[PDB]
Write a protein that binds this ligand. Structure first.
Ligand SMILES: [Cl-]
Ligand SMILES: [Cl-]
Ligand SMILES: [Cl-]
Length: 581
């Protein structure tokens, strides 16, 4: 809060990140808008920002960033002919207009896959106009990921630039470049989903659900830190994410840079793992600190039982600083439990809270909450067995067939869900094994259950766009923290009237041969979903057999002289034969 907010953020961030961040904001709020229209909007805004830096009294410089940005966006968005319902946001004044633009962010926009050009062509284009090339990178990611954590997209952008800078001078450009880009492509996806969970927690469940999340995760990460210090960080981190999820991207990046700075100057009070992170340059520093490994737990920590169970002033302490007290409980339990998922720790906290709510009213409170910690046992236990058992299945199957097993499992749980959503969610669910099952049973739950949190939230938000399954709605609506157990407890749905057998749904074209491996698997996993919708009584054994028939038949037809008269003819052989069998 300054006399000219646009001047203050252009000074704090510098021209280059200001520019980049304004493009991301525009690309995120108006996803269907072409690249050159955005570029032009960003350049007017930038040229204007410059006049405020020079005279913060100049006309309009005291407007709010949403007033300035939203007006600029509306010069193109107000065209209902091409933007349809976005034009409604433009008929509104702030802060309603901002709210409208937030509501219209599209988790799955109707946007073509990226035909990646040739290495020499990308390299030439990078050398032709460096700035435009990198801007296009920012645009294509921001419009497809409208909740991508914006300061962190700057960090991706920097690594994307460095990949080209380095690899376009290699003797073997492709060998150098493609691995870097593939790696960037997949970390950006993981990052966006992870950020998507932060914005959903904030927007659907409120500042308090996010603060709980952050007290737990940060107490695990920095267990040496005092409660006042963890609270301080949680306050600052909640403001950063609130800003970013609210489209206040310049503020978010600016407050994030301050957080990193604060952390790096107070390592002594925070953690001993931070030394490397705190020597990195500005963008990398923040990324590094958000993923640093947990610190060692201080030695010889007393029991929680003394302060939270045995003490004869639990009700006193609870009934006087309710949220401070429970925040202390969760801090103390999370700092001692790096091996529990954040969601489990929050379920434990919630069970502790509701016991107090119940016992502090009771005749003898002290006697009523004496056993509260035993109530934690079955809650700890359910996520461990799940993880154990599904890892076994992963070790047995491999990533792809584990994706197939989860695909059948989730299709049977919630068969009304669109097929594209079921494939994308299940595939991602399968990636939990490769990510988490190589770890010892003690790093597995935080890794695996916190990842499932991220994937189920994707299903939640892709389904809320057009709801069709009451079970998904219920599990997504009922309580963030129990989301994973809720979906895991779904049995097969017996209301579900099987989908009528379709011909064209099970017929592969010849263009399928020229797709990537991943794209071709998706075609197969699409088909497996539609088979389960059509025959939901089919056995795990009957299904892993028609998957193999589709597999071998696509290989056969793709490796053939008449690829057209094969997929037509020797494909009909695959359909009515697996229809009967
Ligand atoms: Cl973060
Ligand atoms: Cl993927
Ligand atoms: Cl599950």
């Amino acid at each position: 809060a300054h006399k000219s907010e646009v001047a203050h953020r252009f000074k704090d961030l510098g021209e280059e990140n200001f520019k980049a961040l304004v493009l991301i904001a525009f690309a995120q709020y108006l996803q269907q808008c072409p690249f050159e229209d955005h570029v032009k909007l960003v350049n007017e805004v930038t040229e204007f920002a410059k006049t405020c830096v020079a005279d913060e009294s100049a006309e309009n410089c005291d407007k709010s960033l949403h007033t300035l940005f939203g007006d600029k966006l509306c010069t193109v968005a107000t065209l209902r002919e091409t933007y349809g319902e976005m034009a409604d946001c433009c008929a509104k004044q702030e802060p309603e207009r901002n709210e409208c633009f937030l509501q219209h962010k599209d988790d799955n926009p109707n946007l073509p896959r990226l035909v990646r050009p040739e290495v020499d062509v990308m390299c030439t284009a990078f050398h032709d106009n460096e700035e435009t090339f990198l801007k296009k990178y920012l645009y294509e990611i921001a419009r497809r990921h409208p909740y991508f954590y914006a300061p962190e997209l700057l960090f991706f952008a920097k690594r994307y630039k460095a990949a080209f800078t380095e690899c376009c001078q290699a003797a073997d450009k492709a060998a150098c470049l493609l691995p870097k880009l593939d790696e960037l492509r997949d970390e950006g996806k993981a990052s966006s989903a992870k950020q998507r969970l932060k914005c959903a927690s904030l927007q659907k469940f409120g500042e308090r659900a996010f603060k709980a999340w952050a007290v737990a995760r940060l107490s695990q990460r920095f267990p040496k830190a005092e409660f006042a210090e963890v609270s301080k960080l949680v306050t600052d981190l909640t403001k950063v994410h609130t800003e970013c999820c609210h489209g206040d991207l310049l503020e978010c990046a600016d407050d994030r840079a301050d957080l990193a700075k604060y952390i790096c100057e107070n390592q002594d009070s925070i953690s001993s793992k931070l030394k490397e992170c705190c020597e990195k340059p500005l963008l990398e520093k923040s990324h590094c600190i958000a993923e640093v490994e947990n610190d060692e737990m201080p030695a010889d920590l007393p029991s929680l039982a003394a302060d939270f169970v045995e003490s004869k002033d639990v009700c006193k302490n609870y009934a006087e600083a309710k949220d401070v007290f429970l925040g202390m409980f969760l801090y103390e339990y999370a700092r001692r439990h790096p091996d529990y998922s954040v969601v489990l720790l929050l379920r434990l906290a919630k069970t502790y809270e509701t016991t107090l709510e119940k016992c502090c009213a009771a005749a003898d409170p002290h006697e009523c909450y004496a056993k509260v910690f035993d109530e934690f046992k079955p809650l700890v236990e359910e996520p461990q067995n799940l993880i154990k058992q599904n890892c076994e299945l992963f070790e047995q199957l491999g990533e792809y067939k584990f994706q197939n097993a989860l695909l059948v499992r989730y299709t049977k749980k919630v068969p009304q869900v669109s097929t594209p959503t079921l494939v994308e969610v299940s595939r991602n669910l399968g990636k939990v094994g490769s990510k988490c099952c190589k770890h010892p049973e003690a790093k597995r739950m935080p890794c695996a259950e916190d990842y499932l949190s991220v994937v189920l939230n994707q299903l939640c938000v892709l389904h809320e766009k057009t709801p069709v399954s009451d079970r998904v709605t219920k599990c997504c609506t009922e309580s963030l923290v129990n989301r994973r157990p809720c979906f895991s407890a779904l049995e097969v749905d017996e209301t579900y009237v099987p989908k009528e057998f379709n011909a064209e749904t099970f017929t592969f074209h010849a263009d399928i041969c020229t797709l990537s491996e991943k794209e071709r698997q998706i075609k197969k996993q699409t088909a497996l979903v539609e088979l389960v919708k059509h025959k939901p009584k089919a056995t795990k054994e009957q299904l892993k057999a028609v998957m193999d028939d589709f597999a071998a038949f696509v290989e056969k037809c793709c490796k053939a002289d008449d690829k057209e008269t094969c997929f037509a003819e020797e494909g009909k052989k695959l359909v009515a034969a697996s229809q009967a069998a």
